[PDB]
């Protein structure tokens, strides 16, 4: 009976390995996605900043 209990415990610990492994992959993927989030925000912001400049010069020239 002790041996039976031992095997059940070993199983839960082994099941933990793959879960924690896939969790590490998910953090990496979410990190890659969120870094891209910051980079794309900056690019969109640059276009907007450029836009107000172009509109101001057009109005001023007139």
């Amino acid at each position: 009976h002790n041996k039976q209990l031992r095997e059940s415990i070993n199983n839960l610990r082994r099941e933990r390995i793959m879960f924690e492994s896939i969790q590490s992959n998910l953090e990496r993927e979410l990190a890659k996605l969120k870094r891209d989030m910051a980079d794309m925000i900056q690019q969109a912001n640059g276009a907007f900043e450029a836009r107000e400049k172009a509109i101001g010069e057009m109005n001023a020239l007139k």
Partner: protein
């Protein structure tokens, strides 16, 4: 003792599973955010293509 070690290990494994499930929610919705936000970038991109187009018209 072993009958209770098993309960603590089961608790630890479930605490990881509910964590894994929550991680998938973060993965999914963040992908959705990229689609909506890149649409926003295209709209601003479209705005400036039309914008510098009419500037040159006024210059000529």
């Amino acid at each position: 003792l072993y009958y209770l070690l098993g309960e603590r290990t089961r608790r630890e494994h479930l605490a990881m599973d509910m964590k894994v499930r929550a991680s998938q929610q973060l993965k999914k919705d963040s992908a959705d955010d990229l689609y909506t936000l890149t649409a926003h970038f295209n709209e601003m991109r479209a705005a400036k293509e039309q914008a510098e187009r009419e500037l040159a018209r006024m210059k000529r």
